Design a protein around this ligand. Structure first.
Ligand SMILES: COc1cc(C(=O)N2CCC(N3CCN(C)CC3)CC2)ccc1Nc1ncc2c(n1)N(C)c1ccccc1C(=O)N2C
Ligand SMILES: [Cl-]
Length: 257
């Protein structure tokens, strides 16, 4: 239905941003295409992306009102669908996905991009279960010409968002993305999100800051990954662990089945 490609089936919906499976009549190659009708910026960021744990951009076509963004197809679906509610997933799978997630985030941060909405719905799987960080509609540049800019816009998804974003006028980009990786890791290992939002008026968040790890979800989590979560989910962003230091963590380097 667009030039050489047939639009075969709906892969996912969105806020005026639907994604279709697209197959080339000539060559049979299947990709994914996002149909939308701001996106200049998104396209600009998408064209920068070249890494095995990040979704690839193939190109775009405007056809009147509708813009078509042609992107890598992740035929394994989302990480969201591999997480069993109240259980999670086997720790070795969770570690491998975490490794890949960190590789993606290091890449993005190294090109000065912050994703700002890391969560299991946006973490897609290829056919060999390699994880790909997808959806750059909230992404932005936080480093340009080697100069950092602080962020001030609120975005993300509350249960994944770092607390400084609810409390500070301006904050550093990178620790926000790290925080959301720790909520992802929590979800993979326990099959449940720990709080609705990281605010002191939220009892489960208060409980975590008082170290009540005999409660859920923390009691489902082995002590080694939990020690890593204690370094990631730290309320002050300048004391929170950085990715270089995550890579030296004991669990991160533990050999697992
Ligand atoms: C075959 O490739 C995929 C399969 C599935 C999947 O598991 N489905 C397909 C949809 C299916 N139902 C959907 C509703 N329909 C009426 C009945 C069938 C349920 C099962 C989900 C995603 C697939 N691939 C895919 N790759 C790249 C993405 C992307 N998704 N989307 C939708 C994204 C989702 C979140 C964030 C980013 C993306 C994205 O940008 N792309 C390009
Ligand atoms: Cl969950």
């Amino acid at each position: 239905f667009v030039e050489d490609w047939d639009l075969v089936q709906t892969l996912g919906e969105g806020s005026f941003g639907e994604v279709q499976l697209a197959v080339n009549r000539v060559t049979e190659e299947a990709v994914a295409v996002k149909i939308v009708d701001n996106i200049k910026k998104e396209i600009c960021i998408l064209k920068m992306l070249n890494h095995e744990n990040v979704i690839k951009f193939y190109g775009h076509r405007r056809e009147g009102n509708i813009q078509y963004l042609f992107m890598e197809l992740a035929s394994g679906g989302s990480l969201f669908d591999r997480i069993e509610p109240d259980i999670g997933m086997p720790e070795p799978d969770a570690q491998r996905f975490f490794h890949q997630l960190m590789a993606g985030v290091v890449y993005l941060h190294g090109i000065g991009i912050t994703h700002r909405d890391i969560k299991p719905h946006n973490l897609l799987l290829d056919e060999r279960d390699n994880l790909k960080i997808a959806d750059y509609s909230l992404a932005t540049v936080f480093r340009y010409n080697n100069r950092e800019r602080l962020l001030n816009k609120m975005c993300g998804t509350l249960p994944y968002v770092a607390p400084e974003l609810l409390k500070r006028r301006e904050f550093h980009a990178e620790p926000v993305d790290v925080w959301s990786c720790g909520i992802v890791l929590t979800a993979m290992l326990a099959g449940e999100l720990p709080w609705d939002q990281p605010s002191d008026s939220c009892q489960e968040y208060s409980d975590w800051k008082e170290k009540k790890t005999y409660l859920n979800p923390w009691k489902k989590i082995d002590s080694a990954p939990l020690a890593l979560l204690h370094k990631i989910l730290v309320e002050n962003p300048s004391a929170r662990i950085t990715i270089p230091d995550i890579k030296k963590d004991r669990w991160y380097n533990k050999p697992l089945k």
